[PDB]
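Researcher: I need the complex structure. Ligand is chloride ion. Inputs:
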Amino acid sequence: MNIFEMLRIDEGLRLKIYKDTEGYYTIGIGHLLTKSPSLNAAKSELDKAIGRNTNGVITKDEAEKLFNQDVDAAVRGILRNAKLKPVYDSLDAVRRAALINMVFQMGETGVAGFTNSLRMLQQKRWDEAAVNLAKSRWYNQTPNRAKRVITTFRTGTWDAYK
Ligand SMILES: [Cl-]
Ligand SMILES: [Cl-]
Ligand SMILES: [Kr]
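Model: Output:
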């Protein structure tokens, strides 16, 4: 298991524009296209991201490409954020993947806001962090996925994913 396979399980793969859990237009492996209610706008952002007239549909390879770029960007976002980097550098490999997953889902900003959890993770107070992390909109809106990431931080193993 690794970050890619982990996110591929949590996000799935769809080759046609779809709406995510929040109703936003997305494609591929969780690649958000736009928060706008306009499908044309979505189609527009898609063609711009792929570089061709896709008509709302992409291939597997193109989806994989976007995903790679999105994972890369997520890590880079973490390393560039002053609230995040320190946590990330303090963690072991498995838990780092958990933090990247959260960022990929909710953005750097969103994650940087879990101040209290962040501190518990940094202190290696696993059970405590897990409990504070569950007290969130994130957990109540996508509880199965959230439980998987939370168990990951709690245990430091990939058991939630096997
Ligand atoms: Cl893009
Ligand atoms: Cl879920
Ligand atoms: Kr967090």
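Model: Summary of the prediction. Residues 49 surround chloride ion (ligand 1) (CB under 6 Å).
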